[PDB]
Design a protein around this nucleic acid. Structure first.
Ligand SMILES: [Mg+2]
Length: 102
DNA sequence: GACTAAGTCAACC
DNA sequence: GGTTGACTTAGTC
């Protein structure tokens, strides 16, 4: 296929938002992206590292530790509540200012 | 075409 | 897996 019309930032945000808990683990971020965008069924070690970079680099995704083991392995990732509706209203490729913190 | 957000590669933790 | 950074790629005005 051709590449979906969304940035990883957009992708990760749709994945978190649809989450029943509004937070996912890395692997669950990967699974959503693959369940819906067959394009991402390929080239995995390239884009999966780029998802990790996004999650760490971007202030709009903060991690939320697990507690009582649950399944276990891997933190949870959620959206900073002060992110606004950023990749929202028709701009999924380039944000008009990336959410940086202070 | 600039300006700066986004994606790559890759070491380290 | 989660951070970092140096550097490239690319959307948008
Ligand atoms: Mg982050």
């Amino acid at each position: 296929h051709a590449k979906p019309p969304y940035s990883y930032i957009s992708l990760i945000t749709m994945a978190i938002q649809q989450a029943p808990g509004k937070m996912l683990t890395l692997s669950e971020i990967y699974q959503w992206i693959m369940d819906l965008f067959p394009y991402y069924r390929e080239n995995q070690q390239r884009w999966q590292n780029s998802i990790r970079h996004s999650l760490s680099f971007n202030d709009c995704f903060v991690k939320v530790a697990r507690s009582p083991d649950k399944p276990g392995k891997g933190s949870y990732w959620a959206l900073h509540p002060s992110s606004g509706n950023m990749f929202e209203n028709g701009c999924y490729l380039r944000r008009q200012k990336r959410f940086k913190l202070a």
